[PDB]
Design a protein around this ligand. Structure first.
Ligand SMILES: Nc1nc2c(ncn2[C@@H]2O[C@H](COP(=O)(O)OP(=O)(O)O)[C@@H](O)[C@H]2O)c(=O)[nH]1
Ligand SMILES: [Mg+2]
Ligand SMILES: [Mg+2]
Length: 166
């Protein structure tokens, strides 16, 4: 059975944990320890193929733990997440991608840009800006809401489909 190692990265508070938990348990967690970094597993069928997803939900920033180094270099695909109502988290994306491009020693890494918290009013980051950024990286842009579950499966499944084109 094919396994896909995914790594969720992004600034603190953007919803990396909420997105993962939504995908794994189908519920929205309002408060999940911001410091807990762990991997979760899920068997699913994508485009007729039964596969296992090994997802690392990252936490600490500027830190380098043993489990993350491995998943960072062994990670096959990355979900780069920012929040639609957090301009700084969006501006921060550049750093996360430069980071991945180094560890992978390549600018062609399976990746999906994710604009989360799309259930919230008065966004400060326009879909257009994110589309522009994703286009410059040559990757897809998908908006999600860990709260309503909108786009969550699309985000993770599209990343699996990107790992497949590699
Ligand atoms: N309204 C809304 N809140 C969200 C969403 N995703 C996460 N949150 C909230 O944002 C906060 C941080 O989310 P969390 O998953 O812990 O962030 P992480 O630090 O990136 O793991 C929590 O209070 C969540 O309830 C979303 O899609 N919509
Ligand atoms: Mg978290
Ligand atoms: Mg493509």
């Amino acid at each position: 059975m094919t396994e896909y190692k995914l790594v969720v990265v992004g600034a603190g508070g953007v919803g990396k944990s909420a997105l993962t938990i939504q995908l794994i348990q189908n519920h929205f967690v309002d408060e999940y320890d911001p410091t807990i970094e762990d991997s979760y597993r899920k068997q699913v069928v994508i485009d007729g193929e039964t596969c296992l997803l090994d997802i690392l939900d990252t936490a600490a920033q500027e830190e380098y733990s043993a489990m993350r180094d491995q998943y960072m270099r062994t990670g096959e695909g990355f979900l780069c997440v920012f929040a639609i109502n957090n301009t700084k988290s969006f501006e921060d994306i550049h750093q996360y991608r430069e980071q991945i491009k180094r560890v992978k020693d390549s600018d062609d890494v399976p990746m999906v840009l994710v604009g989360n918290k799309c259930d919230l009013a008065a966004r400060t980051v326009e879909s257009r800006q994110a589309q522009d950024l994703a286009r410059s990286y040559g990757i897809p842009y998908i908006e999600t809401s860990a709260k309503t579950r909108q786009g969550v499966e699309d985000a993770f499944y599209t990343l699996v489909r990107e790992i497949r084109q590699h």
